[PDB]
Write a protein that binds this ligand. Structure first.
Ligand SMILES: [Mn+2]
Ligand SMILES: [Mn+2]
Lengths: 97, 97
């Protein structure tokens, strides 16, 4: 499933027109990206949380070259899947259908 | 930011009523959970992908007890943040505002 196919699906479930479904998906996405960029967290119950995390200085092998190199600290985005999402994927809880 | 606050925001950006914004966020979430449960993948460009992954048998320390135990294989959900999301969080690319 890609964005288009997601948007198709969401259009049927929303009984919306498609443009509308497209604004929804773009602006959910956009909003989350924006909060985490600020370093804020987005917690969605039954889904998971999006957060910014900080990578400490580390060291890397440069694979094109072989040359080892030290990596300056970086902020990254990340998602922790919530208990209900895990439960369903794993087989523990049933999906409501 | 929690679901409510996300929903507030999305309501303003959608110029929707709130119930509508709530259906959007619930059914985006629900749809993704459902695809990954099937083991399908959800790829959203400029965001990232949601996928099911399989954890091999491993072994665990039971921390309540001390007792070491072997873990049977499990399917888990996961999100790989896409290049544009990483770029923005890291500081490499600018957010459009
Ligand atoms: Mn199931
Ligand atoms: Mn920036």
């Amino acid at each position: 499933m890609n964005k288009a196919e997601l948007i198709d699906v969401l259009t049927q479930k929303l009984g919306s027109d498609r443009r509308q479904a497209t604004a929804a998906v773009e602006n959910v996405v956009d909003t989350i990206v924006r909060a985490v960029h600020k370093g804020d967290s987005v917690t969605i119950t039954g889904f998971g949380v999006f957060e910014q995390r900080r990578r400490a200085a580390r060291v890397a092998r440069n694979p094109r070259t072989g040359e080892t190199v030290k990596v300056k600290p970086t902020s990254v985005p990340a998602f922790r899947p919530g208990a209900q999402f895990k439960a369903v994927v794993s087989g523990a809880q049933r999906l409501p259908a």
